[PDB]
Every structure is written in C-alpha cells, then in structure tokens.
C-alpha cells in the first residue's frame, strides 16, 4: 500500500489474503499455485481501486453458495467483491442508504414534511418551501420511529427507551410546540406508532407488547424453530399499518397477521 | 467451504455514530434490523459468538472501557461490562468462542470469560503487560493471542491454560 493498512482478512483455506487501508485500494495476495504452496511463497497477485475514501473494515464469507468479501470505509457505502473471482469478476456497491426503516414522512394537509435524524426533527412546508420548525430535543439521546397525526396535531417521537408527544399550533411563518405528560408512554418502549385515529394510537414495544392509548391485544405466539432460537429477533413484530381500526403486523420469520382494533 | 450456506448467516455493520445494522445476504442483502446508539457513541469493533446450539451473541466495543453484549430482540444491550483496565482499542474472540480478548490503551490484553451462557461475562485474566497500546488482536486457536501494538511491534502471548507460561 501507499499508506496505512487499516484492515485485512483471509479466506477459509488460506489461499488468499485481502488487505485494505487508507489509500482506498484492496490488495489480494495469492498462494494458490502448488509451487507457491509447497514453497510457502505469497505473491502480490492483484490490486483494485473500488472505494471512494478509505477502507476501515473488511470481512469475507465463503460457503458453497457464497464466496464474497465485503468492505467499507470513510465514504459510507458498502462494497461487495467475489472472493475467488476478485480481480476477474464483477463487484457491486450497495447504496449509501437503503431505507428499510424510514426517517422522513409527509402529511398532505398543511403540505408539511418532517424528518428525524439523530434526536432532532426538522419540519418544513410546501408552497416554494419554508423551513417552519426544528426540535433539537436533548433529553432524548437515541432516536427511533416517529409519526405525525393526521391534521398536524400531535407528533410522537419514539425510541426503545421512552416516547414523547408534541401538540402543535400553526402561527403563520412558524409553528408552536407543547409537550404533554403520559407516563405509560414514558415508561414503555415503542417500536412503531401509527395513529388508529386522531387520538388513539397503536404502539408496538421492543418487548413485543402492543398498546392502544389515548389497550392490549393478545398475539398468538409462533412455535419457535431452531433458527428462531439462533437469531433472537425474527419472531418479533416488525411492521404495523393501521387505517380506521384495522391493522396489520408482520414478523420477519415469514408471518404477517391482521388484527382488528 | 464444503457445506451449504446456513440459514442464520447475518452480517453485522458497526458505523461511527454508533448504530449497528444487521444485513442478510439472501437475495441481494435485505437489512433485517438496526440497533442505534445515541449521542457521542461509536463502535470501533464488534464480534460474533455462536456456540453450537445456543443463541447468537453480538459483542461490541465502543470508544470506551466497556464491552457491550447486545440482546438482539429489544435492540437494547443486555450487558455493559466495564472491562477492568484501560480504554478498549480492539477485541477478538476465541476459537470455540468461550473467551473474549480485548486489547486496551494501557497495554493490557484482558480476557473475558464467556462460557456461562448468554448475558454473563466474567473477568478472567490480565495478560503480561507492556507499554505501547495494543491496537489489534487475533487468536491462534484456544492457545495463543497475537497482538499488534502502536510501537511497530507484534507481541505473541500464550493464553494456554494449565501451562507454566500462562
């Protein structure tokens, strides 16, 4: 390399060693030839510049249906090359964000759109556009899912620790926010908030409890498989969608349930 | 290599603002879950432990003196073990994955005993110290631990139990 070698890995049978660092290239060292093996000699086999800024992390998986090395650095994207077909074959750069969980949402009335980055919500309205408010809530430390009510009334921020509700007043070139205390909400974790009504909210918790606030749906358990006891979150409720007192949840072991409210 | 792809194969990504993604390489990498860390948190490294027939454990070291074993259900840490020396610079796992090496800022390599089931981590043994901070680590087998330091040197410790040079 031309500068520091931040991270490096090998394959299963130790015929290749891949290495990368701050000079944004990946070097592949080979010991495949039987003369190179019986002489125990490595050769600087190849070299690929596929990254943008750095590579601070690299790993490799190798099975009968997989041999790929994965890498990522200061440019935030992730890159995948093949392992035994490193210099020869194709690669694939995954995009910098695939939003399987969303961080931005729009309400059509008032033509307004909120976004939550880490522990702050920024809201702006359409016309052109004006940035109408932001909330840099500091007693919050880690962020997760939000939802804004229809009619732009109550926003709820929610994280795996607590959740907070904010009632708003449109005052022209600006919006006015006020909190309100709800202790069941502050004590229980939320995964998703999705607004059955303007006032009743169904809430999934991180300990998989469903609440119906401002009450408690029974959920029939699935027979846990060996892969389910291996990966301890596939039998957890991922999604819930609700419109007018009928909702759907989905757990990522291949199970979607409806539920009537 | 000579077996089929197991159905629990996941990839763990630790970012620098402190959020861990977990991806699945089935049909072009769907992101199963996210475990966010809050303000001023990072993750300098992480490791997997799957003792055969028990739940997956995901440990991570941030920029501080702790080892965090995460419970993957709630997206919350089930253990925040303050490692008993130094700021942690690196971490690695045993082969058979019952011990957990951390390489510190004051030059210790601290072993953390894992085989108590998920959730529990014990202090085990601070290895023979040095001066320069040990920035990276690896194991040979259960026997030795290799560590690259910040003085341009690579130390080889023998962590083999019931041997005289432990």
């Amino acid at each position: 390399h031309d500068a520091d070698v931040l991270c490096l890995t090998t394959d299963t049978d130790n015929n290749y060693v891949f290495s990368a660092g701050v000079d944004r290239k990946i070097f592949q060292f080979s010991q495949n030839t039987n003369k190179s093996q019986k002489n125990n000699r490595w050769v600087n086999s190849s070299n690929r510049l596929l990254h943008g800024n750095d590579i601070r992390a690299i790993c490799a998986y190798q099975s009968k249906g997989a041999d790929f090395l994965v890498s990522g650095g200061v440019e935030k994207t992730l890159v995948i090359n093949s392992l035994t077909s490193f210099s020869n074959g194709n690669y694939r750069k995954m995009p910098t964000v695939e939003p399987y969980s969303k961080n931005v949402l729009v309400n059509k009335e008032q033509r307004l759109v909120v976004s939550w980055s880490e522990s702050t919500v920024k809201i702006w309205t359409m016309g052109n556009y004006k940035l109408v408010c932001k909330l840099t809530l500091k007693d919050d430390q880690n962020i997760s899912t939000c939802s804004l009510s229809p009619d732009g009334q109550v926003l709820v921020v929610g994280r795996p620790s607590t959740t907070k509700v904010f009632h708003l007043q449109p005052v022209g070139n600006k919006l006015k926010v006020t909190k309100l205390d709800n202790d069941l909400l502050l004590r229980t974790s939320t995964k998703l908030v999705k607004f059955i009504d303007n006032s009743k909210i169904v809430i999934c918790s991180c300990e998989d409890d469903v609440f119906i606030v401002d009450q408690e749906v029974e959920l029939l358990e699935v027979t846990s498989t060996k892969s389910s006891i291996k990966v301890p979150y596939i039998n957890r409720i991922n999604h819930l969608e609700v419109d007018q007192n009928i909702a759907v949840i989905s757990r990522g072991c291949g199970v979607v349930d409806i539920l009537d409210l | 290599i000579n077996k089929l792809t197991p159905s629990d194969l996941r990839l763990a990504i630790g970012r620098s603002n402190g959020n861990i993604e977990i991806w699945n390489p089935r049909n072009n990498w769907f992101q199963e879950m996210v475990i966010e860390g809050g303000k001023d948190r990072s993750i300098e490294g992480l490791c997997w432990s799957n003792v055969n027939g028990e739940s997956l454990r995901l440990f991570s070291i941030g920029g501080s003196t702790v080892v965090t074993e995460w419970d993957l259900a709630t997206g919350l840490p089930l253990r925040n073990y303050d490692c008993n020396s130094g700021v942690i610079w690196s971490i690695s796992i045993n082969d058979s994955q019952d011990k957990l090496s951390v390489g510190c800022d004051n030059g210790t390599v601290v072993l953390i005993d894992i085989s108590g089931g998920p959730g529990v981590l014990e202090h085990d043994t601070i290895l023979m110290r040095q001066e320069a901070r040990v920035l990276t680590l690896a194991w040979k087998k259960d026997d030795f631990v290799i560590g690259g330091c910040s003085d341009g040197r690579i130390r080889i410790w023998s962590a083999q139990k019931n041997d005289e040079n432990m």
């Binding site: 099975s63 009968k64 249906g65 997989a66 790929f68 995948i80 090359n81 093949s82 194709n90 690669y91 694939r92 498989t225 060996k226 892969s227 990966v231 596939i234 990522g252 072991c253 291949g254 | 089929l4 792809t5 197991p6 159905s7 194969l9 699945n24 390489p25 089935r26 049909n27 072009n28 990498w29």
Partner: peptide, 12 residues
Amino acid sequence: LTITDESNFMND
C-alpha cells in the same frame, strides 16, 4: 454476488 444456493430460507 449473493447467497444463491439450494439453502433454505429463514427456517432451518
């Protein structure tokens, strides 16, 4: 560049 074999889905 994916996990394409005869392996099962998230079951076993």
